[PDB]
Ligand SMILES: CSC[C@H]1O[C@@H](n2cnc3c2N=CNC[C@H]3O)[C@H](O)[C@@H]1O
Ligand SMILES: CSC[C@H]1O[C@@H](n2cnc3c2N=CNC[C@H]3O)[C@H](O)[C@@H]1O
Ligand SMILES: [Fe+3]
């Protein structure tokens with residue numbers, strides 16, 4: 001049933017990024033009504049109402065791309081190059097995935113305490129699914145396929161794994177699918193995964209042009225990936241699995257597909273993604289990009305292509321923190337756009353845009369959306385024009401978290 | 410106990426200019442570093458000295474934070490960010506209110522330094538309100554008494570000379586008195602010359618903020634931009650032209666001095682080369698988070714290299730930062746520059762140790778015989794590879810496990 005919450009500052013997280021003072025929200029499981037808090041308490045004098053002075057009320061965050069299974073990692077993988085990182089992940093041989101549950105639960109709570117209400121979890125083995133189901137998080141689990149050599153047996157085992165994930169779906173868990181990358185998934189295997197997504201009305205995700213090594217491989221079949229398949233996979237393949245970026249992009253034509261990273265995608269490739277996929281969603285991971293390729297996503301190019309970004313943490317396999325607030329501050333440091341303008345992009349990248357990417361009914365304070373709401377408390381009240389930036393700079397731990405109208409924190 | 414002891418760790422960062430990394434090495438030290446070598450061989454050579462080895466840990470010099478403003482430690486959201494003019498205007502409009510009831514935040518700021526591995530601080534001070542707490546802290550302190558004043562006044566000079574004498578009388582083995590000229594837009598030329606002369610007469614170090622914003626650059630070079638109305642609007646002073654005709658006019662005042670130049674992101678290559686050739690002993694200080702919050706432009710490290718200079722990394726104050734942990738500042742530094750990460754990690758580490766020690770004329774910042782025994786130990790859950798050790802340390806180091814200052818255990 002219904003209650004009223006208000007704060008000195010409310011971030012609607014519409015595309016305008018509206019900031020409202022002394023506003024309130026009536027909600028049960030959904031957002032019922034928005035308005036001035038005092039007027040709301042007069043209009044509904046019999047409801048529970050709480051006001052949080054010197055606080056910010058905003059939608060719970062959406063973290064559209066993380067790898068919970070790698071939550072054990074601290075220094076198991078090399079940083080400073082993508083090729084060095086990928087080689088270290090493969091040479092690790094999955095050892096970091098063992099004894100996983102403690103780090104995954106710690107990872108889940110880092111999300112919730114950071115204000116994250118919804119997660120796009122990339123999963124290769126569904127080892128994190130149980131803990132996610134037991135958490136209050138909204139979860140879209142992308143079962144991610146790996147395989148550079150076609151095998152009908154591996155397809156059937158993968159479709160059997162996806163059926164197990166589908167049978168766990170409920171109001172908090174949506175099953176989805178992922179193609180790992182252009183260098184790691186053979187074309188006909190990827191086409192099969194994409195077809196299964198269409199047959200099951202599932203979302204799609206993929207890592208795209210994350211490194212110069214991948215760009216030189218995809219475009220000219222040269223560079224570091226020349227020996228990658230023999231050295232690491234014991235596969236006799238010495239040419240790219242896809243002749244050019246367009247060959248890969250076109251597989252996702254007329255789909256709802258998340259494209260992650262993308263820093264080495266030219267303006268031609270980004271425009272192709274928009275025009276071919278129709279419902280594409282660019283995901284940016286600032287800290288992961290700095291640790292691996294070392295190149296940040298060119299946001300001006302993204303704007304020139306007519307696209308927008310959601311900001312995600314990635315996994316601890318390529319990050320030091322799963323707090324989305326930490327990622328948003330790294331995002332502010334990773335781009336030289338005017339900070340006040342960049343703060344709005346960061347906030348929308350953590351709310352409305354991620355919700356649209358995951359096809360969730362949240363990420364914005366608007367009637368009929370889910371009552372996924374965060375309250376962050378501070379020692380002062382920010383000015384209207386500084387509110388968003390100061391929030392991103394100082395927000396560390398959530399003071400109140402409501403998910404589906406129920407108090408979680 | 411002024412006796413000697415041995416400490417070793419799986420990884421030791423010497424922080425020489427080579428940035429040497431050594432495995433299973435140890436250090437013998439009393440108040441100074443006495444001997445360096447393989448830890449096991451050190452325990453055989455000195456079997457009666459007290460000896461500890463820290464597995465899966467990093468031993469390195471205590472950090473030097475060459476530029477901070479402790480007096481502004483109360484600040485969280487009192488000042489505007491997103492532009493330098495917006496920030497400076499908000500600081501002035503604050504009217505010093507954030508400076509009142511200061512001691513609680515200053516003690517918290519001090520302790521944030523120590524737990525971050527910082528052993529030495531370059532503290533910029535306008536009123537010496539933080540000096541007392543600094544003195545009874547174990548930190549090595551170089552307090553730069555900073556002069557502000559855009560209109561010449563002999564009375565203001567004499568009161569400033571008198572405040573510096575008050576600071577000089579507090580000097581000891583842990584406190585060095587120094588002087589600072591705030592900025593080209595805030596200090597009248599003959600007032601700055603007087604401060605610089607006082608530093609020479611007292612053999613004091615100097616520090617200054619230089620070309621931190623586009624607004625300052627347009628003012629200094631062409632007497633145009635936001636600073637046109639700054640003196641009437643904020644200071645009630647009838648001044649409409651720059652206090653210095655060009656950057657070289659300001660730089661040349663510090664000719665043949667030991668002067669720290671802070672920020673500098675809007676200094677051209679010629680200006681940086683002028684600083685190097687004229688000052689002779691200049692030290693560039695970079696504050697990545699403050700630069701992002703104010704002007705929004707990062708220091709061009711390639712330009713700094715082209716000018717033949719190097720940088721030390723500092724936190725600035727909470728007036729223009731969210732954390733005074735130098736480790737947080739170093740991670741922000743890694744995010745603020747697109748240089749190859751392994752190469753940038755070496756610059757960051759040396760920027761927090763040896764370079765800052767040289768800037769403050771301190772006998773530390775490096776694990777070398779006869780240097781001060783200012784040593785940090787950071788513990789981890791794994792042993793880093795030799796080539797990843799410095800970067801992984803910067804990424805994962807949060808709180809120090811052991812801090813020794815002058816050979817005495819502090820943490
Ligand atoms: C062992 S092949 C690559 C594996 O690394 C995993 N991964 C973890 N974090 C990331 C991963 N993949 C690509 N780029 C970095 C980041 O997205 C990915 O799921 C895949 O299982
Ligand atoms: C014209 S008043 C400026 C005052 O702000 C203080 N300040 C605090 N942090 C910084 C300050 N000065 C210049 N740029 C930003 C940073 O260095 C400075 O010491 C001075 O007292
Ligand atoms: Fe990923």
Ligand SMILES: [Fe+3]
Pocket residue numbers: 476477478533618671725726
């Ligand atoms: Fe400063």
